[PDB]
Design a binder for these strands. Structure first.
Lengths: 108, 80, 29, 48, 93, 93, 79
DNA sequence: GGCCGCTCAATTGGTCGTAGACAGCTCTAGCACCGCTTAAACGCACGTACGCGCTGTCCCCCGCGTTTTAACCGCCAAGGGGATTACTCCCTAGTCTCCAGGCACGTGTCAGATATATACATCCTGTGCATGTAC
DNA sequence: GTACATGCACAGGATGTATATATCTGACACGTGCCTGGAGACTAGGGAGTAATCCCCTTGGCGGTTAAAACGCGGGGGACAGCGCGTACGTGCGTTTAAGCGGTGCTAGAGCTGTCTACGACCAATTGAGCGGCC
């Protein structure tokens, strides 16, 4: 009982296992949310968060700046054939578009 | 009144040029305006049905985001 | 039935001078 | 004052103090170019 | 020259991040299209920005698909028939 | 009063691990919160189907392992399944 | 290797239901690739539902749930 | 006929002040989450009852290998319809302002349609049989 | 002109259900305060227009060869019985999460403090074009 700790810290996660369990159990996704589900899901969300942030951080550094902006996220996801399936029909606020040409356009 | 014409000829030129097209035949404008208006019409109608159900007068950013989920044409960064 | 704005008007009017005076006394030190 | 020009100009400042006033010693300054335009009657300079 | 500044224009709007449609014309157009769904609506300032981002994105994707139609038919010049082909084979209408 | 309930702390705790030199803009925080929120709804939605598709009452690691294998594409699916099994392995002792 | 058993005549018939006036000889071999990759989507999803159910047998429900997830629902199988 | 002499109108270099917008607080307060209960229903492990799906040999219209041809592919050069870009003026989009009013949320207490204990009954699913529609 | 799949009824248990009960979510009425509809004044870029002029798409004639359509050559796909590995019921046992009521942490807010870049702006140096002298 002395000194409580997060179920995230017990899993070895940043992502909030309590919050994820609370959201699963009030979202009516099941009548019985077993605690392995929110731990596993928090880990899945944390991995996808790490992958998408690392690609965005590379895109930001390649664009010579030390901050993630929605442009650096669009220039991460539209440069990855995996995340361009997972996010393949989502729109990014301030993201713009990938720079692209059909070769038939180019002069001389 | 007559607001569909407010999608200006340079604005079509620019939006099509972000889309990478080389030559705009002058036939393009009114069909592009009508197509846009019909996509707006669907999103707005859906957002209005969420707003009417919610017993509410103000269309929120959530209602347009939920209309974009209902249409499977989602938009991140406006919340949710 | 028609004077109904007054009980809204007074609540904003008393806020105007109070917040301007509050900010004008962050200018104390 | 060199930035918020409209928002000063909309109020009729009747009489002007301008202070440590060596700041206006060049006509090339955007300060001098702007500050000429406020419709006050009397201008008083406090040159240290 | 013509078609060369039209091509050089592509790289500027594909690098740059801002919205291309004018805010007030778009804002009135949303309210106009809403009038015969309901009168006397209020629109939150964030909602119309979201609707504009969705509409410019929908058109940019439709313009790529339009460019695909034209260039497949060996045209650098787009035509309304490219939009009729795309809006059919999209499965939309 | 209402409260924003965002994932902002945790996406930042992860950024500061993967790129210690790099920060998050307020609009990119929005995109990240949207991505986490949507993937949670996508996975938990499919997990609720996967329970009733076997008429099981619970959801557990196997329902979400299945939902990840269905929803995610190539390499990301095996990596997410590896991370979920690693976290549950540490959590269960 | 059994995909070659999907016949050039059957691919003509299957295209002719789509109303095409004339075929070209490259279509038959490319259609076999399109059919194989479409199966390599829907089967792997159906197997994933089959594995979740602890089954050895791929049921009507296993393929219906895959086709429903792929957004190409088929009425007349399962329920 | 040519170059440089004095003057003053000129780019080209460092501190002041701000404002955007995080970054990290810098707390701090509150509300979820964690802890350690008391408890019971869904899942497993277990066997059992059995279609159901693999795997064997028959057999015809379908698969597949070669025939001429005629209309469609696609080239080439004409040829004229029309898109871009030249340029300036005009007007309405941007911008922030500010009101005053509507109405989204806050937030309080009351109360009614819902969950659910258990007691009914009639609804409508598996199997059989009668017989007629598409082939 | 044919008879296997449809179409109607029996047998019967479960599921659709009524009466009986306690109560938390939703309704309502109150106001705060957030903020959006309206609407004003001005800026000056976006847009439309007149306009010049350059070049692409369609067009029409023509030559090539591929699929179409026909035909010949010959076998594997649709259909019946046995084999034997799975799939669906039902129970005991209890693993597992429920649902509970506090103890505590950490997550969230608004704001501060600290950037701290990065931007105009002012301030002082020092330099090139401006006009005049000389042999």
């Amino acid at each position: 009982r002395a000194k409580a700790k997060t179920r995230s810290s017990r899993a070895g996660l940043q992502f909030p296992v309590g919050r994820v369990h609370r959201l699963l159990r009030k979202g009516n996704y099941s009548e019985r949310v077993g605690a392995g589900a929110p731990v596993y899901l928090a880990a899945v969300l944390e991995y996808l968060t790490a992958e998408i942030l690392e690609l965005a951080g590379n895109a930001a550094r390649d664009n010579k700046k030390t901050r993630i902006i929605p442009r650096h996220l669009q220039l991460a996801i539209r440069n990855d054939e995996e995340l361009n399936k997972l996010l393949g029909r989502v729109t990014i606020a301030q993201g713009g578009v990938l720079p692209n040409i059909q070769a038939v356009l180019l002069p001389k | 009144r007559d607001n569909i014409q407010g999608i200006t000829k340079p604005a079509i030129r620019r939006l099509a040029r972000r889309g990478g097209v080389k030559r705009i035949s002058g036939l393009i404008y009114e069909e592009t305006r009508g197509v846009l208006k019909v996509f707006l019409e669907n999103v707005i109608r859906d957002a209005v049905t969420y707003t009417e159900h919610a017993k509410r007068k103000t269309v929120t950013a959530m209602d347009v985001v939920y209309a974009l989920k209902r249409q499977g044409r989602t938009l991140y960064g406006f919340g949710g | 039935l028609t004077e109904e704005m007054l009980l809204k008007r007074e609540e904003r009017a008393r806020k105007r001078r109070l917040q301007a005076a509050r900010r004008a006394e962050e200018h104390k030190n | 004052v060199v930035q918020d020009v409209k928002y000063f100009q909309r109020v009729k400042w009747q009489y002007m103090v301008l202070d440590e006033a060596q700041a206006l010693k060049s006509s090339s300054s955007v300060r001098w170019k702007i500050l000429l335009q406020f419709q006050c009657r009397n201008r008083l300079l406090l040159t240290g | 020259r013509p078609g060369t500044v039209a091509l050089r224009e592509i790289r500027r709007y594909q690098k740059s991040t801002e919205l291309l449609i004018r805010k007030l014309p778009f804002q009135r157009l949303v309210r106009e299209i809403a009038q015969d769904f309901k009168t006397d609506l209020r629109f939150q300032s964030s909602a119309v920005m979201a609707l504009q981002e969705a509409c410019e994105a929908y058109l940019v994707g439709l313009f790529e698909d339009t460019n695909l139609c034209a260039i497949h038919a060996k045209r650098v010049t787009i035509m309304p028939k490219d939009i009729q082909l795309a809006r059919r084979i999209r499965g939309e209408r | 009063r209402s409260r924003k309930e965002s994932y902002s702390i945790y996406v930042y705790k992860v950024l500061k691990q993967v790129h210690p030199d790099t920060g998050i803009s307020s609009k990119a925080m929005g995109i990240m919160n949207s991505f986490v929120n949507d993937i949670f709804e996508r996975i938990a939605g499919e997990a609720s189907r996967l329970a009733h598709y076997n008429k099981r009452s619970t959801i557990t690691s196997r329902e979400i392992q299945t939902a990840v294998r269905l929803l995610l594409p190539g390499e990301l699916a095996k990596h997410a399944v590896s991370e979920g099994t690693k976290a549950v392995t540490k959590y269960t002792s």
